[PDB]
Design a protein around this ligand. Structure first.
Ligand code: NAG
Ligand code: NAG
Ligand code: NAG
Ligand code: NAG
Ligand code: NAG
Ligand code: NAG
Ligand code: NAG
Ligand code: NAG
Ligand code: NAG
Lengths: 344, 72, 344, 344, 72, 72
């Protein structure tokens, strides 16, 4: 009687336990599908998207390297690419062609350093494209290097004229724009194919031809042999500007120092008036305002500022706190069930 | 021996002085510019980007070759 | 008897339940290891990869921002970098140096607006690189701005000649290419250092020198004083083209209009023949075909088209179905298991 | 009795298993939160971070496309952007403007291939910017195309003079730098607006004017009609260089072959001495060293080498071995539970 | 009919020869360069990059437009 | 003045007219171009990229400095 009710009590109590394990077991299968679904999403939609981002980023790195190379080529060989017939070469391309230094450029070309300044300023070095290969994408340039010969003792003089007054009459002397001297000898000079520079004149053709005996006496002191023009019904120039010094014919006209306001009065004995930049930076001659001094403007600076942001900082996932509790609970029942199993 | 003193009494002045150098037979050199750099990988991630660069090169280089062929 | 086998009936059933719980308990550690394995893959493989991608992408953003700056430097200061000795400045570099506008440029330089047009077209502004610093990567440009003085009342005239014909004899008058007039006065003009432009001539050196009395009469009407050349055994030009109007000496030769086909006959009283581009766009003179009309070609457009692609957009992982199902199937048995103890 | 102890031990054993299951249930709760925490991390800090990475890379792709397009525009239309008043056009811009080929350029413009060589080398084609639209970022470029007329039968000759000796006296003949011939006719030539080239001179203005009867006799053979210049107290040039041939007046001076060391003797029968670039590459005349031969330097190559790196390789996650282990053990408990029910 | 034999006995030599071509009335064409390419996406991922390119264009184009107005 | 009617009867024509302006002492200004922009972060990500830009700068700037030192 007592046991029979107890057997029924164990019958009902054990009945729910079998159902209890079934429910948690099927819930366990739900976890497996959940974890598998996480794995599928990572493998099928994160890894392919990660690799596509990595593949696209490699292409952008190469495209920037290739564009930086072309910009360097455009920087150095720009004029040659646009003008394949005849274009000046860069100082960067000249350095590269002859070794890798300007000292190698001067030694190989036999330039004095002041010869390179004359050649660079006159644009004497030309590059011509002689072959373009559109299959392997290269071009061949043909650079021509000028060769200079200096005639010792020859000095080139540039002449500039101005009208002068002797009494009430205005005269003008006709002289060549350029003359050349070699010691005591004087010759004419043709500037058609020449570049006049402080270091020296570089002429692509000949410029020297002899001078007539009459013009030689003019330049040597006998000014009465010089050809003069009376300015009657015509006009010339009344001032010259030369390296910040003004040479003017202030006779029978009004010359005024515009800065100080004083009248520049010419001594009758003297022929021409010389005005320096410091004494008068701005001068009025015959109503014409002339700037003798050089104005300086405040310095300017070209700048750029780049502001960027640090990349993202993804921390650790850190889900071990929940895993540890489940591990602790799993071990709790692991020993609890085994110890109770010994009773059986 | 130009008399620069006597010559300024008649309005003539000298505003420069330089040496004289005349150009002579020129030298020559050939420079080869490789516009396409040497890429070693050449993966599938760089196929499109290399083609875009070649199109840029043809925009510049092709008119030069055509002009050289026609004018020579 | 019956209770004895009843105890065994519970004994056989209960012992299997302990084994049943043991199986799912070890399967629980299988889930934990899988979840831990997922976390390790994320922390050790995906997080380092995104940070590497982010670090690489930040470098490419700077590189593109930093190459775009150079392309701006090359765009504005290109000719100066290639030719440090002497190079013209760009219109963009001129505005930056003098304030930030052309209006500031005109007032600081004292230009009239038509003076800037003359200076820009003659390339009068030059920049020289005076200092290069390689440690801190900057250069210093020295810019020289011309100052212009206008001689008020002086007008420069360009002369062009053609071989006129009187009777059956062809002549040619020798005149200077350029002359200058100041009211009623006429002088000579030297174009060596000058740039002839519609607004005005900008001369780096002096150009005005007086004219002889004999040539003054020739230009003032007394054409008998002009120096004339009989062209016998020689040849000159027989037509001039000027601003779409053709001046030709059609005497003794065959002039015809190529377009209409008519023959241009010169009246004996008239010396020269004037042909306008409207009446005849193409003219043949002495067998030479002259294009006096202006041809226009169809407009061309340079343009580019860029096509992009929408960025990827990964959706939500969405594993809450199986995970939510397990939650329902987990704590449903929480009360079911607890119910067993209550009846006990 | 005996069953009472057996039932009590069974009741105690069953009671422990109830605590055993509940511990497993709470461990199951930890797994759900751990899996949910993993899913939350992916949707909160991985998907948003990757989309930002993808969004950033799309902008970088367009920026590189845009910069490459500008570098193409700067490559073609560079000089026009910096010089909006008057700049030469590139060969790439000329090809695009008139069709898309140089053959279409030649036919549309009426050039002959050698006409384009003389126009490209003289820089006759100029572009002017006539409209800038900053609202929509385009510029209108106006291009002027020269039209050429050839005077048939006219040939331009360049004359270069040198001094010569008659016994012990040095003379110099004055001739124009340029002359022109048409069959048997000879005329003068003005090189002010011309560009001397092997294919033909292109003059922007007229260059032909008649020659005096006295100078015609000089050029036709009667050399006694030419104007001479005794070189006394002056000096000229004693050598000419003409494309690898040296014409020198080695009379009364010392000329030697710098290469071979020999002395170049001037035979009195001949007036001038001709030296070829092969017989003597370097020549000294009157102490002046002249380079007659053409030096050649070793070829140079400009090239770049780019080394890349393979993208990251994220492999399969591969955590299915632990999931499969739990699946197998869950299946065992599913079967084992049914067996226990049969006993009960 | 220049006699180059007699003329070289007096130091005169000819160092060139060419034809003669004189420039007549010039032709004209208009070329429109569109510096902003036509982009079809215009998403939120490209707003900043398009503005950076526009600022580059204003650096170059604006001094040209402002100088044309002043000089004309 | 010039009698343009009479000069046309002898083949002389006037094909232009302009004012006369002569150049005087020039002004001067110094412009400093900083080719390396001021970058603030300078972290470990932006190390190889800045070095590659500096290598580009040396390709351009170094020949200029060497030529300036040699010619001056
Ligand atoms: C220079 O001028 C002075 C006085 O004007 C004169 O006596 C002299 O002969 C001239 N010539 C020379 C060479 O001194
Ligand atoms: C450079 O390119 C050529 C042809 O493209 C190839 O043969 C060569 O191997 C490359 N250089 C190196 C170092 O691999
Ligand atoms: C690379 O591209 C080629 C050409 O389409 C293709 O055949 C090959 O399978 C690709 N390789 C990989 C690893 O995707
Ligand atoms: C111009 O010619 C006309 C008629 O021949 C006459 O006035 C005179 O000869 C000339 N004019 C002058 C001002 O000499
Ligand atoms: C060239 O000189 C020779 C000999 O002096 C002779 O034929 C004649 O004088 C000259 N020729 C001509 C065509 O004048
Ligand atoms: C730009 O592209 C769009 C879309 O293709 C289309 O309207 C046309 O091709 C262009 N439109 C304009 C206004 O440039
Ligand atoms: C795009 O940007 C605009 C302007 O900030 C904003 O209104 C819009 O919501 C954005 N679109 C998306 C999809 O974020
Ligand atoms: C760059 O910016 C920083 C900001 O901290 C400043 O201190 C530094 O002087 C700047 N460098 C320059 C302007 O060269
Ligand atoms: C780069 O520098 C950062 C500090 O900004 C440091 O954390 C990191 O370890 C460095 N990496 C290397 C490879 O030196």
């Amino acid at each position: 009687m007592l046991n029979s009710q107890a057997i029924d009590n164990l019958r009902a109590s054990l009945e729910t336990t079998n159902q209890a394990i079934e429910a948690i077991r099927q819930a366990g299968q739900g976890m497996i599908l959940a974890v598998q679904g996480v794995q599928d999403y990572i493998n099928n939609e994160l890894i392919p998207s990660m690799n596509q981002l990595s593949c696209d980023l490699i292409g952008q790195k190469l495209g920037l390297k290739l564009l930086r190379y072309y910009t360097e080529i455009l920087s150095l060989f720009g004029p040659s690419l646009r003008d394949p017939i005849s274009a000046e070469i860069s100082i960067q391309a000249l350095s590269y062609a002859l070794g890798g230094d300007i000292n190698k450029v001067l030694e190989k070309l036999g330039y004095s350093g002041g010869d390179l300044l004359g050649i660079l300023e006159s644009r004497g070095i030309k590059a011509r494209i002689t072959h373009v290969d559109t299959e392997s994408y290269f071009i061949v340039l043909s650079i021509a290097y000028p060769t200079l010969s200096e005639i010792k003792g020859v000095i080139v003089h540039r002449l500039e004229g101005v009208s002068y007054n002797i009494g009430s009459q205005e005269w003008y002397t006709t002289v060549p724009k350029y003359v050349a001297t070699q010691g005591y000898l004087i010759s004419n000079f043709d500037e058609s194919s020449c570049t006049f520079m402080p270091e020296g004149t570089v002429c692509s053709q000949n410029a020297l031809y002899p001078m007539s005996p009459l013009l030689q006496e003019c330049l040597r002191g006998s000014t009465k042999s010089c050809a003069r023009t009376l300015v009657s019904g015509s006009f010339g120039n009344r001032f010259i500007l030369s390296q910040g010094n003004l040479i003017a014919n202030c006779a029978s006209i009004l010359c005024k120092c515009y800065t100080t306001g004083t009248i520049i009065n010419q001594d009758p004995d003297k022929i021409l008036t010389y005005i320096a930049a410091d004494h008068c930076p701005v001068v009025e001659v015959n109503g014409v305002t002339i700037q003798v001094g050089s104005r300086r403007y405040p310095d300017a600076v070209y700048l750029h500022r780049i502001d960027l942001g640090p990349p993202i900082s993804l921390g650790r996932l850190d889900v071990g706190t929940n895993l540890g509790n489940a591990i602790a609970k799993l071990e709790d029942a692991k020993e609890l069930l085994e110890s109770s199993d010994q009773i059986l | 021996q130009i008399h620069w003193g006597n010559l300024s009494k008649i309005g003539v002045v000298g505003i420069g002085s330089a040496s004289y150098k005349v150009m002579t037979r020129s030298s020559h050199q050939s420079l080869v510019i490789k516009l396409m750099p040497n890429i070693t990988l050449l993966n599938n991630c760089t196929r499109v980007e290399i083609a875009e660069y070649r199109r840029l090169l043809r925009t510049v280089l092709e008119p030069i070759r055509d002009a050289l062929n026609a004018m020579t």
